[PDB]
Design a protein around this ligand. Structure first.
Ligand SMILES: OC[C@H]1O[C@@](CO)(O[C@H]2O[C@H](CO)[C@@H](O)[C@H](O)[C@H]2O)[C@@H](O)[C@@H]1O
Ligand SMILES: OC[C@H]1O[C@@](CO)(O[C@H]2O[C@H](CO)[C@@H](O)[C@H](O)[C@H]2O)[C@@H](O)[C@@H]1O
Ligand SMILES: OC[C@H]1O[C@@](CO)(O[C@H]2O[C@H](CO)[C@@H](O)[C@H](O)[C@H]2O)[C@@H](O)[C@@H]1O
Ligand code: LDA
Ligand code: LDA
Ligand code: LDA
Lengths: 341, 341, 341
């Protein structure tokens, strides 16, 4: 096989921000924006070859392809070469992290890049990435399957390759999943002895502007629920923790945050209504409570399946971030269209 | 369906510029340049899905692909998702403007980017663009069809999305076409309450360097002719008008220019000879006649069809711009090859 | 026909540099680097159309596509339009140079960009490029075939197109090949009356930072050997020469260098062991011996063919550059996987 595949998806999104700091017009409310936005259109090529006696060569080259013409690049979405057989699957390339894959049971929503935090559960997803790495995925044995994945030191920091003067940013990713009669539970996590975070607590490249070096960077996620008989329910808990590793007054002090998320949906023929809620508890930053990181959000919407490949989509979200006067409120809604090929 | 399609096209172009201002060697004549040039090679992917009872989902992802290796990007040519049925066609994405589509009956010529104004009718085409927009196209009823298209404020100016401090650059595009027994007539136009022009009178993005803000920016084009029985004839008139909207002495003053174009071609078996003429009358700039905008051009050439997909091409053009001493004359010729797949 | 094709290839590479100048830790040895690296994954589209009575239109659009997601661009590998028939083949576009094609019988090794000089015979290949050009390839007549290729002045230097104030960087490329019963011999070469080299003696664009202008830039390569009955042997000699053309004390003085390369491999069923050796003799730079350019290298490895399209790969290389204290030693090894589609 060699298959061309992808998804074209886009819609009209309407959004308003409430922020006393950045806007002054009527209680810190911004104007209402209305935008045509691509929702993350993508195109890939992939294939497999039977190598004889169980084993297959596998490969994939997947690309961002926004119908707004803003992307460029090959292989900037999940892309790999690997082998598959009775042993499971081994791949190397630009790979989804185990946590990024588990996000499929957390964030079912479609939106443009501008609305990812309010028309989707974007905040809980901040830990998810693609990385140049090697990954093993097991076969499914008695309901159970698992993954392990590694990003080498010299891929996490190319510059330092021959002069190991910077602490390693290598990382480990692992997951375990169980499925039985519609019921599912999964753990997914990561560890990096050293890492770097921006102020949104996303991992960024070493030496990025305003990056914060951290040590013992760990992320744990558990997701459980039910997906069968027209019903979908998902509940997720997530925990992120690190020590400050920046040279200065606060080195050694602990960062941490807990997030939770829940989704329910029910299929009525070709219509799926869906509701999501998510909450970020106050973070500990340099060992001190920081309510700037707390958030609450709800999203409601529905998908209308014209076919198995084509859906019309609608949603509305409300998000509140922080506390008091630095507080930010986002509201948004969209209508859209998705076509898989 | 999912179809791969495109056109590979390129040739050798020979060109000379006469410009007393920029060249001094022998009456302001430049040296003669000879270049291999891609003519606008492109590749796309597209598809459709019957949704039951008349309606279809449609999508397209088209890209610039120069065989000289100078392009990068997905979806930087006409790209969309939409629906089609008895109601007509609705699309959203990076869409040809109605005026850009009408250009098919104005500029039949192929050339590289360097020769677009002399080996093609590039000046009349300066009003044509692709825009992130929504568009409706009607069915053909008794010879008649039409289009309407809109570019939202927050797509024309993303930066200003939440602070509507800049006047809207939203625009409307519309067209009407009639066809009967080889005869065709079409109107295509656009209006933008506010817009921005460079000195070549092309629309550029707000806040571009040396952009000129304008108000009441309107473009009207009429094209009429005959296309049947081996004969092609086309005549076009175009009118562009705007008011100066730049803070300063000349705010409120009128810009305007009229252009006309005509083409004839006749098919003799596999050979098509073609001739084009175009003229830009003196522009009004800040309410004052500006002969720097006037131009006259002729192009002659032929296409040699090896097949329905493969043509060899030859052309020669002469263009004169401006008047007196700021005057510019361009001459050029090419030979080339075009293959559609 | 319209065919999608390509090769996905990548592996894990381990490398160490010995350089007293840039490293100080234990006799100028660097740390050992271990990296997942793409080996030059690529994807193309190509086609042909019978034009009647022997002739065919041909075209190709080939792209770099690294599964690490670092490439962007269309047509940045061999890409063209052309015609083919009894006369041979004519193409125009981003074309392999005749010398670049002859490199197929010189460098059989796969590696990432970081290891090209030690896990491949990269130094001898420094003369190889793709150029926007026109090329003719003859049919094979009684074992003999040949190529001629030209890069025009205004493609080698676009800026200067209309003001021929800079000496032409146009170039000629030519080759001749003979094949008989497994035995092969080929000459490939190039001439450019004027050119520009960086300090690694690679051709760079005019006006590049630290480019060195040269005159009478010639490259000659002869490759001979045997490729049949499970046995492969190749021997190559290469000669490069130019005159300094930089305004200053040393203008007119001669640069030159000779390189040689040899490879043997034998197929044992699905396993091919291979060995390569290459040597660069002391260069003459500005008429003076420069041992900084001398080098010696060996590579050993094997390919394991799972199928005709899928190979596992292993190699190890040792390279020594220069002499004395400016001396550089590189060691490396890899394991990898290659899949052609
Ligand atoms: O997979 C869950 C979620 O993915 C959606 C919305 O993001 O579609 C996107 O992700 C799919 C992964 O299965 C891709 O196949 C698709 O191309 C992409 O648009 C929905 O299908 C689904 O709710
Ligand atoms: O369509 C008119 C004109 O288009 C030409 C030359 O520009 O071909 C280009 O535009 C076509 C649009 O129909 C594309 O299909 C093609 O890929 C592109 O090269 C000629 O075909 C024709 O005279
Ligand atoms: O062709 C010789 C050499 O090419 C290899 C390794 O570079 O494969 C690369 O080059 C091929 C050219 O034939 C391409 O087809 C392929 O896509 C690319 O990886 C080996 O196949 C061979 O030893
Ligand atoms: C949602 C997936 C997109 C993230 C992929 C980008 C890779 C970032 C790697 C550097 C951060 C450490
Ligand atoms: C000939 C079509 C190419 C033009 C498309 C580029 C889009 C420009 C949009 C910003 C101008 C207002
Ligand atoms: C190995 C082939 C890659 C080289 C192609 C890049 C083109 C360089 C042209 C400018 C140099 C003169």
């Amino acid at each position: 096989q060699v298959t061309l595949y992808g998804t074209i998806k886009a819609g009209v999104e309407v959004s308003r921000v409430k922020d006393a700091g950045t806007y002054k017009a009527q209680g810190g409310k911004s104007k209402t924006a209305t935008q045509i936005a691509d929702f993350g259109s993508k195109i890939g090529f992939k294939g497999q070859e039977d190598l004889g006696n169980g084993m297959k060569a596998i490969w994939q080259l997947e690309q961002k392809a926004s119908i707004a013409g803003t992307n460029s690049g090959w292989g900037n979405r999940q892309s790999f070469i690997g082998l598959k057989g009775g042993f499971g699957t081994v791949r190397a390339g630009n790979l989804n992290t185990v946590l990024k894959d588990s996000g499929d049971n957390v964030n079912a929503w479609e939106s443009g890049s501008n609305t990812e935090d309010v028309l989707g559960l974007g905040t809980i997803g901040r830990v998810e990435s693609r990385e140049i790495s090697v990954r093993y995925d097991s076969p499914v044995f008695a309901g159970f399957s698992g993954s392990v994945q590694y990003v080498p030191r010299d891929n996490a920091n190319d510059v330092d390759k021959y002069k190991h003067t910077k602490s390693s940013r290598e990382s480990y990713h692992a997951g375990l999943k169980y499925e039985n009669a519609g019921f599912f539970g999964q753990y997914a996590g990561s560890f990096a002895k050293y890492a770097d975070l921006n102020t949104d607590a996303e991992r960024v490249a070493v030496n990025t502007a305003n990056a914060h070096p951290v040590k013992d960077y760990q992320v744990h996620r558990v997701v459980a629920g039910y997906d069968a008989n027209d019903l979908y329910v998902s509940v997720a808990g997530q925990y992120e923790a690190a020590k400050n590793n920046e040279v200065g007054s606060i080195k050694g002090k602990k960062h941490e945050q807990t997030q939770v998320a829940a989704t329910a949906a029910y299929r009525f023929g070709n219509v799926t209504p869906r509701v999501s809620y998510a909450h970020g508890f106050k973070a500990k930053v340099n060992g001190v409570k920081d309510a700037n990181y707390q958030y609450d959000q709800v999203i409601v919407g529905a998908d209308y399946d014209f076919s198995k490949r084509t859906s019309a989509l609608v949603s509305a979200g409300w998000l509140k971030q922080g506390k008091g006067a630095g507080k930010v409120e986002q509201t948004a809604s969209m209508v859209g269209l998705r076509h898989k090929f």
